[PDB]
Amino acid sequence: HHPCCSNPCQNRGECMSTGFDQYKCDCTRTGFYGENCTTPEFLTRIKLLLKPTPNTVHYILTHFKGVWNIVNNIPFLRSLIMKYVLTSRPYLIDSPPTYNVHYGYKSWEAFSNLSYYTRALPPVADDCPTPMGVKGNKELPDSKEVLEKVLLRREFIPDPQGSNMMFAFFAQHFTHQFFKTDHKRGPGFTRGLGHGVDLNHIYGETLDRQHKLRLFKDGKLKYQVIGGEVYPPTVKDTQVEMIYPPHIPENLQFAVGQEVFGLVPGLMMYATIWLREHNRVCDILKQEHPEWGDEQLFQTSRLILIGETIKIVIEDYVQHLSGYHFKLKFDPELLFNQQFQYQNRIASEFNTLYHWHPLLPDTFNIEDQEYSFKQFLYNNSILLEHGLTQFVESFTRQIAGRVAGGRNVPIAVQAVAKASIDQSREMKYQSLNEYRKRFSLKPYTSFEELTGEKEMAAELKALYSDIDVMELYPALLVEKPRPDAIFGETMVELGAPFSLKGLMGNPICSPQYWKPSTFGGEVGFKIINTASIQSLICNNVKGCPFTSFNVQ
Amino acid sequence: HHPCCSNPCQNRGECMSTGFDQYKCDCTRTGFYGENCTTPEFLTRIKLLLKPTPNTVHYILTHFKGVWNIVNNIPFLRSLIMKYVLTSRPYLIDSPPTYNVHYGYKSWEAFSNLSYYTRALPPVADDCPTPMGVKGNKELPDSKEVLEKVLLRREFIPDPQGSNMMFAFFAQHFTHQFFKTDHKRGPGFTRGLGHGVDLNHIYGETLDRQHKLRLFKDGKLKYQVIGGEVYPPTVKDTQVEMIYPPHIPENLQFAVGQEVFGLVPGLMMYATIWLREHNRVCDILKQEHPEWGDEQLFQTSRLILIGETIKIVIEDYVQHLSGYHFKLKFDPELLFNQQFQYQNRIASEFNTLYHWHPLLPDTFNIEDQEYSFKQFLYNNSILLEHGLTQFVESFTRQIAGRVAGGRNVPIAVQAVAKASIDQSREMKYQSLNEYRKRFSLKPYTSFEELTGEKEMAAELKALYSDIDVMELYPALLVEKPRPDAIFGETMVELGAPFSLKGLMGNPICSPQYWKPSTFGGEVGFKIINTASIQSLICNNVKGCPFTSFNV
Ligand code: COH
Ligand code: COH
Ligand SMILES: *[C@@H]1O[C@H](CO)[C@@H](O[C@@H]2O[C@H](CO)[C@@H](O)[C@H](O)[C@H]2NC(C)=O)[C@H](O)[C@H]1NC(C)=O
Ligand SMILES: *[C@@H]1O[C@H](CO)[C@@H](O[C@@H]2O[C@H](CO)[C@@H](O)[C@H](O)[C@H]2NC(C)=O)[C@H](O)[C@H]1NC(C)=O
Ligand SMILES: Cc1ccc(-c2cc(C(F)(F)F)nn2-c2ccc(S(N)(=O)=O)cc2)cc1
Ligand SMILES: Cc1ccc(-c2cc(C(F)(F)F)nn2-c2ccc(S(N)(=O)=O)cc2)cc1
Ligand SMILES: CCCCCCCCO[C@@H]1O[C@H](CO)[C@@H](O)[C@H](O)[C@H]1O
Ligand SMILES: *[C@@H]1O[C@H](CO)[C@@H](O)[C@H](O)[C@H]1NC(C)=O
Ligand SMILES: *[C@@H]1O[C@H](CO)[C@@H](O)[C@H](O)[C@H]1NC(C)=O
Ligand SMILES: *[C@@H]1O[C@H](CO)[C@@H](O)[C@H](O)[C@H]1NC(C)=O
Ligand SMILES: *[C@@H]1O[C@H](CO)[C@@H](O)[C@H](O)[C@H]1NC(C)=O
């Protein structure tokens, strides 16, 4: 079989077959050498001893609040610290991208073809003896068995950081613009050829879909008015293909950028908020530029809302996740004197780790009601009956589930959580400890080190035998959470660079784009640099209800 | 009308309307400020003082040959100068790209839609009173008159640098992988969504076309053997769509990556050569990796040829073009410690300046024959009759025409030259002087300064009335050439950044790609780093004839 099946090359060294049963490791710019790239250079040997562990870094960022209070209020220091945050993890991500599900080696097909999700690690070769390479049994444990033993939820576990439903639905809405998996081809393929924050879930992936959603007046998007309230247009009026069960009323079949946003009222909530924000920005720009035509009012507004989305995600969404005392800042200027590629390619592993099913509650508490999944699905009437204001007020108060720690996936979505395990095996992912080493983390030496607990670790060991063949996705959900946090180490050290890559890698963050003229002048620019999840809701939802990503 | 038709903002400042009759300049990171971004800051005054003119920089690289011969033999020193060359033009090209033919302002459509050629300068607004903005008459002079008076060829004017027909066809074959105008949409649209050196003119633009060209054994491409010589396969054999006149027999319809390479035997030459080179690399890779399957042999071979092409283009093609005594070097490691975007977007203006019609001869001299244009087109039988070796031997000694200097466009392609002017106007190009200011050059004050003579300059002033409304393309052909050189100043200062970005911006030049393992080991890596126009011909053409881009 393939001589690289055992994954011998360490420290980002690249493995290559030299014969039928011999290999060679490419230690180019790894900082190491030797047959397996395990012998470090002198300078490398220094960089290792002086490198702080991720847990050491996390402690500092979550403690000494009196010190960060000083820093956060010194713009020079804040920008300086943030400059480090954004330049810290420096080569963890291949850009331009490399492998994908069909190529364990670099090729032009893998680079050019935008339909593929890219891969941080190459897949396991087909003719490898065991699923994870050479270690482990001839077969991985039954996925259902793994699901029910350590993943499925017994009793609802709240998020100790206090994440609410405003957060959970934002995460689903925001990420499903670049996590558009194309099941017609397979789990390794995507429909989001933009590979990042292009707001295609609001405007549409194709130009043909966009023009059906547009009004072609003042740059706005088509809309309807129900009970004096602005809601998205219908499938019938725009002739936009959406995903709805046949038994859904015509006027409740809303049409938006993403075909699947009719699935959940919480998504339609955000789909409605952003539609209003777009038309709001149109109004502001038309006031500033009465000379502009419809097309320019539209395009400029889209770039503005893109900036808003990136602004909010960093300084609200990621800030809440981090739990840091340090105030994250969105300022593209901090990369202009740095080496950074203004491009991005969505990793399949970035998709996989973002399956935060445990975030979901058992019921959805709106006003005085508590709907179940069977009731909540495709019930756009709920959104209408209650209104956006009561949606915001209710979802700001309702707590969300904990992602890590194990056993918190709702039974309602068991078929989805299991599908994540199966498709991870279809795309032939490498093991948990292989992705830890890939992102400069110490491999787990025991299942009890992974979960920090004896019970699930016992069950996991009986299922997998070896810790070195533990799978990625279930490990992320059963991993020992950081102190009073929502994630474990692996979720963060892998997730942080992937997230910040698609955010800062956007063209509007480039020097030639990051100008007032790009966004219609100082007015449009100001909309972005002052945007927040609070202001978003305050400007578009009636009554301006208080909101946040935390229940407090 | 649009408040920015007059092009008020200077020094890379961006113009924005703030009403029906007013505008506003964005002077961000220009080094200037004021209403029109024209008042220089202090550090700029320092840098504008120290800045040497391109005319004198070109002088240095073309003189003191004895000293360059020394520098060319000091690795550390060759390397360091080539690094400067790659970085001497830090912010000339927008990357990620900005405007196109439909968007004179930044937008997500202009950025994401890869069907567009990008634009170095935004188009003139639709409601502008004069074709160039506010200057000049209501209409530009008839393109036919501009064509006949100062563009068409009387006496054939040969290239002083000694460019041969190997050069002329290489330039045509090489650039037509990223110059594929989608004429079903317009001149501002491209069919090459790769926007760079992807060698799709060999392997095909889409995956389907590629699989119809591949043999699926040993990673090789389909081929036929005619008289012991290897040639591309037929359209019948591959079902690959090719552009041929109806009177071309089924056996002479060669199928290659590019759909239009069949029309010119000079292109079908390199198409055959590069197809041979591909299968040669597969042979080598197969005995380096007898364990490898077909798919990896192909994909790895495509990367090496991409590397070869960039290697050959820089150190042979661009080298001969420049005329510099300094020996250029293809070394991606020179950009690792520098701010560089490993991405590219083909500019429309890059396409326009590359319309080197004057490079063409009056006849195509092969062995004992002098073929006219009418005889040469679609005549792949010429290729079979003489052979590759006679083709290389003959095209090596046949000289090419001078691009700049005026009056050198062959009569046989006058319609094409007229189309370059018509379409530039169709795409609403800005004037010559605007594109000069865009590239840190000084605007021409008179037509005599532009041409360096009196006769043609008098002709153009009768046509255009103002030097500030002189079009970009016809100027490139009549511009005063550098001393015994093929190009004028504008052709160089525009084309040099565009060419260097398209080559180095290739993902294989990125640090994670520039590894021996990417190309199948040290053997395949050396194939890239030792590639040349002579080795390409020697390894693939029978007899290994001597060739270059000169003599
Ligand atoms: C990040 C938060 C999040 C939440 C709250 C959430 C909540 C819910 C939810 C609530 C009622 C339902 C019915 C589903 C059900 C699904 N989810 Co999510 N999912 C989430 C993250 C994801 C991600 C990431 C994907 C993969 C995107 C893709 O492939 O299209 C996904 C995909 C899916 C799919 C596509 C099938 C597949 O093979 O991927 C279904 C069905 N889902 N999920
Ligand atoms: C650089 C060398 C070169 C050579 C030797 C050459 C030789 C020849 C030749 C016979 C040998 C003929 C019949 C033509 C004729 C044409 N050329 Co050129 N061309 C050249 C440079 C170019 C370039 C560059 C383009 C742009 C291709 C595009 O935009 O699709 C081009 C485009 C064309 C087109 C497309 C239509 C148009 O541009 O309006 C035609 C027709 N032509 N050319
Ligand atoms: C890139 O832009 C072109 C031109 O704007 C788009 O082509 C148009 O597509 C619409 C339908 O989507 C047709 O009705 C038009 O006739 C097309 N115009 C031309 C000139 O062909 C193209 O779809 C865009 N590409 C993407 C990926 O959105
Ligand atoms: C990207 O890759 C996919 C899969 O490798 C290509 O889709 C295949 O296309 C061929 C011919 O076009 C079909 O015969 C296959 O059935 C397709 N496979 C799948 C899974 O869809 C796709 O064409 C590639 N993209 C581009 C632009 O070439
Ligand atoms: C999917 C994902 C994963 C991590 C991040 C991220 C990014 C950052 C920052 F600051 F670097 F931008 N922190 N940060 C983060 C840090 C700590 C936690 S915690 N308290 O659960 O362990 C959670 C998130 C974002 C998205
Ligand atoms: C279309 C085009 C234009 C310029 C170049 C180019 C690039 C370079 C280099 F080396 F800097 F990269 N020089 N160089 C160049 C420089 C001078 C001349 S010359 N003797 O006609 O005036 C000719 C070419 C290449 C292609
Ligand atoms: C909660 C709905 C799914 C339950 C499936 C149970 C499958 C066996 O799961 C068992 O459940 C017990 C209690 O949680 C644990 O003590 C055991 O460790 C575990 O193996
Ligand atoms: C390299 O790894 C292999 C495992 O495949 C091991 O047998 C060998 O001893 C290692 N060699 C070195 C020098 O570490
Ligand atoms: C939600 O759907 C259920 C049945 O599908 C229905 O009884 C209920 O009225 C709906 N919610 C609202 C607010 O109408
Ligand atoms: C700017 O240019 C305009 C012409 O477009 C001119 O009228 C104006 O006086 C200029 N202003 C300055 C400060 O140079
Ligand atoms: C070229 O074509 C002409 C007809 O257009 C034909 O007579 C001639 O034989 C061809 N050249 C060769 C070498 O066959």
Side-chain angles (χ1 to χ4, degrees), chain A residues 1-21 23-50 52-88 90-137 139-143 145-183 185-190 192-240 242-373 375-441 443-453 455-525 527-551, chain B residues 1-20 23-42 44-46 48 50 52-64 66-137 140-154 156-183 185-249 251-326 328-373 375-396 398-441 443-541 543-551:
Chain A
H1 58 71
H2 202 281
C4 292
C5 282
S6 68
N7 300 324
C9 303
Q10 316 290 303
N11 310 284
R12 306 284 262 103
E14 297 176 3
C15 192
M16 179 194 76
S17 62
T18 50
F20 280 97
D21 282 280
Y23 69 89
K24 162 93 176 185
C25 294
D26 194 341
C27 312
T28 300
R29 286 177 297 276
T30 63
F32 294 76
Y33 60 95
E35 182 182 6
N36 297 332
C37 294
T38 51
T39 299
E41 292 167 351
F42 185 80
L43 174 60
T44 304
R45 199 181 295 267
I46 301 301
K47 286 182 175 178
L48 284 173
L49 295 178
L50 266 48
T53 67
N55 288 8
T56 299
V57 182
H58 185 68
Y59 176 85
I60 304 174
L61 284 166
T62 54
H63 289 67
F64 313 101
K65 190 172 184 176
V67 183
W68 293 117
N69 280 339
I70 297 183
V71 175
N72 289 339
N73 300 298
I74 303 300
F76 181 81
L77 286 187
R78 175 154 172 255
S79 297
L80 203 279
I81 296 294
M82 188 61 194
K83 194 194 208 71
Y84 157 78
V85 169
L86 282 195
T87 354
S88 65
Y91 341 89
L92 275 199
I93 298 174
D94 298 326
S95 188
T98 52
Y99 320 107
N100 61 40
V101 63
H102 281 177
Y103 292 93
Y105 56 93
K106 307 181 209 66
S107 63
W108 193 267
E109 170 66 24
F111 164 80
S112 60
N113 198 325
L114 302 178
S115 297
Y116 289 96
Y117 286 116
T118 186
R119 291 279 293 266
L121 283 179
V124 188
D126 301 344
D127 67 337
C128 286
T130 71
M132 291 299 180
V134 293
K135 296 186 178 305
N137 311 129
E139 290 187 310
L140 290 169
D142 190 90
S143 59
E145 190 170 346
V146 176
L147 171 67
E148 295 187 342
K149 275 170 174 285
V150 296
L151 291 186
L152 280 193
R153 168 185 293 165
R154 280 71 171 163
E155 192 176 27
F156 174 80
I157 303 178
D159 169 40
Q161 295 193 220
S163 303
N164 56 14
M165 288 289 98
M166 286 297 295
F167 172 86
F169 282 138
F170 186 91
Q172 187 175 357
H173 180 81
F174 162 74
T175 58
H176 284 187
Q177 73 184 282
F178 47 73
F179 290 151
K180 316 203 302 160
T181 318
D182 185 13
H183 295 106
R185 303 174 185 264
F189 296 87
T190 177
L193 306 184
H195 284 272
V197 193
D198 53 14
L199 266 53
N200 71 84
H201 63 333
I202 305 175
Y203 296 110
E205 183 67 30
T206 63
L207 182 66
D208 127 270
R209 183 179 185 87
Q210 169 187 146
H211 285 182
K212 296 180 174 187
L213 288 178
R214 286 176 58 182
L215 182 57
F216 296 98
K217 180 189 178 183
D218 306 330
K220 303 193 187 191
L221 298 169
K222 273 190 172 176
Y223 66 93
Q224 64 179 165
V225 180
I226 313 177
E229 280 269 275
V230 173
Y231 289 104
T234 66
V235 173
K236 194 82 171 188
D237 174 39
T238 60
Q239 289 176 308
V240 165
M242 291 287 292
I243 306 296
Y244 286 108
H247 65 84
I248 296 295
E250 174 193 326
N251 212 9
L252 289 177
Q253 294 187 9
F254 295 143
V256 291
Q258 238 278 22
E259 307 95 20
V260 310
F261 278 1
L263 188 75
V264 202
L267 291 182
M268 275 301 317
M269 174 193 60
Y270 274 114
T272 305
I273 292 182
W274 284 108
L275 197 154
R276 298 179 179 180
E277 178 60 31
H278 172 83
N279 291 1
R280 191 189 72 92
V281 171
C282 282
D283 278 13
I284 300 179
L285 289 181
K286 189 174 185 63
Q287 185 178 1
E288 283 295 322
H289 301 272
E291 71 281 2
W292 283 9
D294 163 84
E295 180 77 358
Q296 187 168 2
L297 286 170
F298 171 83
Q299 298 291 341
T300 309
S301 301
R302 175 170 187 167
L303 291 184
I304 287 184
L305 264 61
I306 284 178
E308 291 188 37
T309 296
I310 299 175
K311 169 79 173 180
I312 297 177
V313 162
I314 298 183
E315 303 191 0
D316 288 336
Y317 178 84
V318 173
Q319 179 66 46
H320 166 80
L321 275 182
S322 66
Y324 301 165
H325 294 304
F326 172 65
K327 280 163 50 188
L328 299 175
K329 182 184 178 184
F330 174 48
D331 181 29
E333 258 189 17
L334 307 180
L335 286 174
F336 290 168
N337 59 321
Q338 304 294 317
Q339 291 194 148
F340 182 69
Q341 297 293 310
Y342 287 102
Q343 59 178 307
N344 192 42
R345 194 71 67 87
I346 299 298
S348 183
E349 307 95 344
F350 181 42
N351 189 329
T352 303
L353 61 83
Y354 239 106
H355 291 75
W356 299 348
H357 307 132
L359 263 184
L360 299 166
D362 291 325
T363 59
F364 302 95
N365 310 341
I366 309 161
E367 256 184 46
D368 54 329
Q369 305 293 331
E370 291 181 348
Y371 311 94
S372 62
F373 283 83
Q375 306 186 310
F376 203 58
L377 285 203
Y378 292 113
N379 242 10
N380 278 344
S381 59
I382 296 187
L383 180 53
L384 248 261
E385 140 140 32
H386 290 269
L388 261 69
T389 300
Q390 275 303 322
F391 254 62
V392 175
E393 289 169 350
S394 301
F395 281 163
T396 303
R397 299 187 308 255
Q398 176 166 4
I399 194 60
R402 192 184 211 180
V403 175
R407 290 168 170 171
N408 201 14
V409 174
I411 317 297
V413 293
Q414 78 183 312
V416 185
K418 182 187 179 296
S420 294
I421 302 179
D422 293 343
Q423 291 177 355
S424 301
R425 301 175 176 181
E426 297 176 13
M427 299 178 296
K428 292 178 180 174
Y429 278 16
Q430 298 193 24
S431 66
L432 166 70
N433 281 330
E434 285 297 333
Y435 276 98
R436 286 182 62 88
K437 292 189 292 180
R438 167 64 167 87
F439 286 80
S440 302
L441 300 185
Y444 281 131
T445 39
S446 72
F447 287 99
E448 283 175 1
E449 187 182 35
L450 165 65
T451 70
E453 149 270 11
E455 187 176 9
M456 295 181 310
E459 293 296 321
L460 282 182
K461 174 142 188 56
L463 289 164
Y464 287 92
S465 298
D466 200 340
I467 183 63
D468 287 335
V469 300
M470 179 59 187
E471 305 189 54
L472 176 62
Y473 174 62
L476 287 171
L477 297 189
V478 305
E479 193 184 25
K480 169 179 56 192
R482 290 185 168 178
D484 290 318
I486 192 179
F487 300 143
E489 183 191 30
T490 314
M491 180 76 70
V492 178
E493 292 300 319
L494 270 63
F498 277 149
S499 219
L500 294 179
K501 225 293 182 184
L503 290 170
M504 303 305 303
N506 193 276
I508 75 167
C509 294
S510 58
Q512 290 304 291
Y513 273 77
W514 196 244
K515 302 172 179 176
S517 71
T518 309
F519 313 103
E522 282 290 342
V523 172
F525 208 7
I527 297 181
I528 300 177
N529 295 286
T530 66
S532 62
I533 186 61
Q534 176 66 73
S535 67
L536 182 67
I537 272 66
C538 188
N539 278 325
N540 303 288
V541 188
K542 182 175 184 179
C544 186
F546 164 83
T547 188
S548 67
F549 290 149
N550 67 87
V551 294
Chain B
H1 60 74
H2 200 286
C4 299
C5 288
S6 64
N7 297 311
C9 305
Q10 311 295 317
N11 306 127
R12 303 287 267 104
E14 298 170 14
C15 188
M16 176 191 74
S17 61
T18 55
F20 289 97
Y23 68 89
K24 178 77 176 65
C25 294
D26 199 328
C27 309
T28 311
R29 285 180 288 277
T30 63
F32 299 79
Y33 62 94
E35 184 184 10
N36 294 324
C37 298
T38 190
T39 303
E41 276 162 347
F42 197 74
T44 303
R45 285 191 165 276
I46 285 185
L48 285 183
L50 302 179
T53 68
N55 274 11
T56 55
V57 179
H58 177 78
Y59 180 95
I60 298 180
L61 292 149
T62 49
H63 293 79
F64 318 131
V67 33
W68 286 116
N69 184 27
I70 294 162
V71 184
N72 294 334
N73 286 281
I74 309 161
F76 161 78
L77 233 225
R78 171 181 192 199
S79 270
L80 183 134
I81 283 170
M82 185 56 191
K83 175 183 175 184
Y84 152 78
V85 179
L86 291 167
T87 56
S88 66
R89 314 170 183 98
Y91 309 102
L92 287 185
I93 301 180
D94 295 343
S95 203
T98 45
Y99 319 103
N100 56 24
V101 74
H102 287 169
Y103 292 85
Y105 58 92
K106 271 155 286 182
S107 61
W108 195 263
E109 176 67 24
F111 162 79
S112 62
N113 195 329
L114 300 180
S115 293
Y116 284 93
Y117 286 115
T118 186
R119 287 278 296 264
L121 277 178
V124 180
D126 291 342
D127 66 343
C128 291
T130 78
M132 293 290 171
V134 296
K135 292 178 175 174
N137 298 122
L140 292 173
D142 186 17
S143 54
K144 161 189 165 66
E145 291 294 338
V146 178
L147 174 70
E148 292 179 343
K149 296 200 178 305
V150 297
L151 294 188
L152 289 188
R153 165 185 294 163
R154 282 77 176 172
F156 169 75
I157 303 178
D159 179 41
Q161 302 194 226
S163 302
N164 53 21
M165 281 297 106
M166 287 300 285
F167 176 88
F169 283 123
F170 184 90
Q172 189 185 6
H173 175 77
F174 165 75
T175 59
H176 282 184
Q177 64 189 298
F178 42 75
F179 289 159
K180 312 197 302 174
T181 297
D182 191 343
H183 284 107
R185 298 183 191 267
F189 294 89
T190 174
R191 292 258 278 176
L193 308 179
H195 285 277
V197 192
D198 55 17
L199 263 51
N200 72 100
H201 66 312
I202 305 177
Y203 302 104
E205 181 67 30
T206 58
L207 185 63
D208 233 334
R209 183 180 185 86
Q210 171 187 133
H211 284 180
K212 290 154 81 179
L213 287 178
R214 284 175 61 183
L215 182 61
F216 289 91
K217 181 173 180 177
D218 303 333
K220 290 181 178 177
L221 297 165
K222 287 199 184 79
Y223 66 96
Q224 57 175 327
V225 182
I226 306 176
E229 288 286 292
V230 169
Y231 290 98
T234 61
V235 171
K236 169 141 182 177
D237 183 36
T238 64
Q239 306 300 115
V240 166
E241 270 205 324
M242 290 283 305
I243 301 299
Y244 281 106
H247 69 92
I248 307 296
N251 77 314
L252 278 187
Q253 294 188 354
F254 293 100
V256 297
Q258 239 278 15
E259 310 87 13
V260 312
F261 281 179
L263 304 166
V264 179
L267 298 180
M268 192 57 55
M269 184 193 61
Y270 279 113
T272 303
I273 296 174
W274 279 109
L275 177 135
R276 290 180 184 186
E277 177 63 22
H278 175 82
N279 291 345
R280 192 187 69 90
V281 176
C282 291
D283 288 340
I284 296 180
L285 284 180
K286 186 164 186 55
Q287 56 191 89
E288 295 295 325
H289 302 276
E291 76 280 355
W292 279 10
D294 172 84
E295 181 66 20
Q296 189 164 11
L297 285 172
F298 168 78
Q299 289 294 345
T300 311
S301 291
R302 178 168 185 168
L303 290 193
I304 295 184
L305 268 65
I306 283 175
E308 290 189 51
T309 301
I310 302 185
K311 173 73 173 188
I312 295 178
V313 167
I314 292 181
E315 295 190 10
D316 288 327
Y317 176 88
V318 171
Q319 177 76 62
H320 162 77
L321 202 51
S322 66
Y324 299 161
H325 296 289
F326 171 67
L328 302 175
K329 181 183 183 184
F330 171 53
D331 183 28
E333 301 176 37
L334 295 170
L335 286 181
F336 289 171
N337 70 325
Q338 288 290 337
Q339 297 185 309
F340 187 82
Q341 295 298 323
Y342 287 105
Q343 60 170 142
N344 192 43
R345 192 76 68 89
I346 294 296
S348 180
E349 298 91 347
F350 185 30
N351 180 28
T352 299
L353 63 85
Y354 230 109
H355 291 159
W356 297 349
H357 307 132
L359 200 60
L360 291 174
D362 298 321
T363 54
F364 300 90
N365 314 328
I366 306 176
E367 201 164 355
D368 308 324
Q369 254 62 25
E370 288 186 352
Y371 298 106
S372 67
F373 279 77
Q375 298 181 302
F376 206 64
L377 296 186
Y378 332 121
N379 243 1
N380 286 337
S381 55
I382 300 188
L383 182 56
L384 291 181
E385 204 203 30
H386 297 270
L388 269 289
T389 304
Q390 276 297 333
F391 258 65
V392 174
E393 285 180 356
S394 301
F395 283 169
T396 306
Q398 180 175 6
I399 207 180
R402 198 184 204 179
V403 179
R407 293 170 173 167
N408 206 35
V409 175
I411 308 295
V413 294
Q414 55 164 341
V416 186
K418 177 179 165 53
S420 298
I421 309 175
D422 290 336
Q423 290 172 336
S424 294
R425 299 167 171 182
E426 189 178 353
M427 293 181 293
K428 301 281 293 183
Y429 275 18
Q430 291 191 23
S431 67
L432 166 73
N433 277 335
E434 299 292 352
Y435 279 104
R436 285 186 62 86
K437 291 192 289 184
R438 165 66 168 84
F439 283 82
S440 298
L441 300 180
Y444 285 113
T445 55
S446 65
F447 291 98
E448 290 193 345
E449 186 181 12
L450 166 63
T451 69
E453 46 83 84
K454 298 185 178 301
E455 179 165 318
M456 289 181 298
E459 294 273 28
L460 295 177
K461 184 158 174 51
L463 291 171
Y464 285 79
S465 308
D466 199 339
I467 185 62
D468 283 342
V469 295
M470 177 58 184
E471 299 181 58
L472 173 62
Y473 179 72
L476 289 164
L477 300 186
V478 307
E479 190 183 23
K480 168 196 155 206
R482 263 84 183 277
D484 306 89
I486 192 177
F487 299 147
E489 190 208 8
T490 309
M491 178 73 70
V492 177
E493 289 295 326
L494 258 70
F498 279 146
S499 247
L500 284 184
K501 175 121 194 70
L503 292 164
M504 301 304 292
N506 198 280
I508 74 163
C509 297
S510 56
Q512 276 297 335
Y513 272 70
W514 198 241
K515 300 178 161 194
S517 60
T518 310
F519 309 107
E522 217 71 45
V523 170
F525 200 15
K526 197 181 189 179
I527 296 185
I528 294 182
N529 288 116
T530 62
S532 65
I533 189 59
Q534 174 71 98
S535 68
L536 181 70
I537 271 65
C538 186
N539 291 330
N540 297 304
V541 182
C544 184
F546 294 86
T547 181
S548 53
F549 292 143
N550 54 87
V551 162

